[PDB]
Amino acid sequence: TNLMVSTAVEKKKYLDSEFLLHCISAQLLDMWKQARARWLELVGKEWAHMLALNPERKDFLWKNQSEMNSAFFDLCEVGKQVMLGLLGKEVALPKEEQAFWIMYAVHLSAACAEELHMPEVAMSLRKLNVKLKDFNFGGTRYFKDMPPEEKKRRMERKQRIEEARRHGMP
């Protein structure tokens, strides 16, 4: 566990565009770049407001109904397809998924500290993991009330990301 996290720390760069380039389809890579930037922009906007109101705070309060929360779910959906694209498989071994999600949470936590200059403890691995767990148990669990139409939109989005991963193939 501690080994896995520290291996992920060395390798947080594996989710940088320069390391992803040519290991996944260019279409998936662009979806990853957009989704990462969208999430970070929102976290940064929310942080800046919370900070203005309490300059001493070190915790990021994650809002359950926000645009940031919705952007995080989408980033996860893109992330999962990145994993499958790197593996060249439709279904990962559980140990492979485990290692990936650690790298993912380490990469994003590092970005909040290094790119948005937030306190390291604000967006911790633990916090990202809680949200990740919800994502990996689905949309109905993650968004506790989701209107049926929103569920279809999420499904359609996932389908599009999958097709991207397969270079436009079903």
Author numbering: 392 to 561
Sentences from the paper on this structure:
Base-J (β-D-glucopyranosyloxymethyluracil) is a modified DNA nucleotide that replaces 1% of thymine in kinetoplastid flagellates. JBP1 specifically recognizes base-J-containing double-stranded DNA (J-DNA) through a JDBD which has been structurally characterized. In the context of JBP1, JDBD recognizes base-J and then probably invokes a conformational change in JBP1 (25, 26), enabling the THD to initiate the biosynthesis of base-J on a thymine 13 base pairs downstream the complementary DNA strand (J + 13′ position).
Notably, the crystal structure of the JDBD had a missing loop of eight residues (529–537) between helices α4 and α5, including the Arg532 that is important for DNA binding. Remarkably, in one of numerous datasets that have been obtained during the course, the missing density for the loop 529–537 was observed. As this loop follows the α4 recognition helix and harbors the Arg532 residue which affects DNA binding, the diffraction data from the CSHL 2018 course were reprocessed, and the model was rebuilt and refined. There are no crystal contacts observed for this loop, and there are no substantial differences in crystal properties overall. Thus, it remains unclear why the 529–537 loop is ordered in the new structure and not in previous experiments. The final structure was validated using MolProbity and it belongs to the 100th percentile, with a Ramachandran Z-score of −0.98 ± 0.72. In this predicted model, JDBD shows a similar overall fold when compared with our new crystal structure, with a noticeable difference in the loop between the α4 and α5 helices, that we found ordered in the new JDBD crystal structure.
